[PDB]
């Protein structure tokens, strides 16, 4: 229900669990390992095993995180914005 609290986001094809960044207000995805955020492929536009691996994520790796911007910019060469269908670009940048 917070949004400063990662919840499983339906992207269509597949689940990201994101949040917003406290201080920034930029959004903020459980990261996979050292690339962008893990997303969750669904099989189904239903899918409750999809979900259930995202909550999963949640609960066990919310402490590996990318967020938007300037860090993802540093992280990977990229902003995330102005790049769709990259999950940043859904979102505002906050400028």
Known sequence: DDIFEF???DFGAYF?????????YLPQAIRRGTGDAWMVKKAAKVD???Q???QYLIKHKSNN???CGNEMLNELGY???????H???????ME
């Open 7 to 9: 919840k499983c986001v």
């Open 16 to 24: 990201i669990a994101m949040r917003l960044d406290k201080k920034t």
């Open 87 to 93: 999950w940043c670009s859904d979102f505002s940048n």
């Open 65 to 67: 995180v990318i967020t």
């Open 52 to 54: 259930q691996f995202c």
């Open 48 to 50: 409750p095993s999809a």
């Open 79 to 85: 902003s995330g914005y102005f790049m769709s269908p």
